[PDB]
Ligand binder design. Structure first.
Ligand SMILES: COc1cccc(Cn2ccc3cc(C(=O)NO)cnc32)c1
Ligand SMILES: [Co+2]
Ligand SMILES: [Co+2]
Ligand SMILES: [Mg+2]
Ligand code: NA
Length: 304
């Protein structure tokens, strides 16, 4: 395998971390290949759940707890900290909140969060590599509580970064917030990628095509499929009571991705950097609510 950039996997991985049996588990947690029978059944259906008041309470809760976990991770980002150390802290934080860390054994993913450095687009595997000054790193959190999944991510700066890194991360966060600003009943899911690509292109960046936003609730990934690029052919119209993610991945060079031999880590084919942000959204009569919002701070972590 020809690595596309400087980054390499740093093995061995610490042994798999267990989740106490007192924590409720999603179906895939105990499937040998990590398959979700509940997802595979609804595969091919493009209808979107209208959440009950009860489902909404369940999503507010898990999304609040997932934000608390991301904030734990954010406090650890500096040179010399390994991504495995971040994951271990995340895993304990989930357990402390009576939550299962959704990524763990999702299609056999080996860790409890995804940590994506520099040319990693998404799904990076926490490992023994110490973070270096100048790195950008995304931590992607998803929790499972009382039957509901809540999903968010942010990109962080590792010490001082270059102007390029600042512009990439800022634009990506802007792409996400412009998409969010367009969400309200009667907007087509396919329109969000028009707004995202328009802002990325204006700043000289490209938009990943291979990975999309998703419906989330009782399933980790379900309808709708939410592409981040322009002139996609997503099916569906937003209605009050729909929950889904927007999670744009923006690249310094081309949009093309490829996967490492580990089967998970997605990287730019050109080796240039990629950044990502994600929120879980509830569509309301007036617009949308950001379920994974910060409660105690106006801005994302990179802004400080
Ligand atoms: C075999 O196919 C693959 C390849 C890579 C990853 C995985 C599975 N998986 C693990 C966790 C995980 C997190 C997200 C997420 O939505 N963040 O917003 C998505 N997929 C995920 C499967
Ligand atoms: Co996520
Ligand atoms: Co997601
Ligand atoms: Mg090394
Ligand atoms: Na990256």
């Amino acid at each position: 395998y020809r690595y596309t950039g400087k980054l390499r996997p740093h093995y061995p991985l610490m042994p798999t971390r267990p989740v106490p049996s007192y924590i409720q588990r999603p179906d895939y947690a105990d499937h040998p290949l990590g398959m979700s029978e509940s997802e595979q059944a609804l595969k091919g259906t493009s209808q979107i759940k209208l959440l009950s008041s009860e489902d909404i309470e369940g999503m507010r809760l898990v999304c609040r707890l997932a934000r608390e976990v991301l904030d734990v991770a954010a406090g650890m980002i500096k040179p010399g900290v390994t991504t495995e150390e971040i994951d271990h802290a995340v895993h304990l934080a989930c357990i402390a909140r009576n939550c299962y860390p959704s990524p763990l054994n999702y299609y056999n993913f080996p860790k409890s969060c995804c940590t994506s450095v520099n040319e990693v687009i998404c799904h990076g595997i926490p490992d023994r590599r110490p973070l270096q000054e100048g790195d950008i790193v995304n931590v992607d959190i998803t929790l499972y509580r009382n039957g509901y999944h809540g999903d968010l991510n942010e990109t962080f700066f590792v010490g001082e970064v270059d102007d390029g890194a600042r512009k990439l991360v800022q634009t990506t966060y802007e792409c996400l917030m412009q998409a969010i600003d367009a969400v309200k009943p009667g907007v087509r899911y396919r329109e969000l990628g028009n707004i995202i690509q328009k802002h990325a292109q204006a700043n000289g960046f490209s938009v990943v095509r291979s990975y999309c936003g998703h419906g989330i609730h009782k399933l980790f990934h379900t309808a709708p499929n939410v592409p981040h690029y322009a002139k996609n052919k997503a099916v569906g119209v937003m209605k009050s009571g729909h929950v889904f993610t927007i999670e744009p991945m923006i690249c310094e060079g081309g949009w093309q991705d490829e996967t490492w031999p580990d089967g998970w880590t997605a990287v730019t084919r050109d080796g240039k950097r990629s950044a990502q942000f994600e929120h879980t959204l509830l569509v309301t009569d007036t617009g949308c609510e950001i379920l994974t919002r910060r409660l105690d701070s106006a801005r994302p972590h990179f802004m400080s």
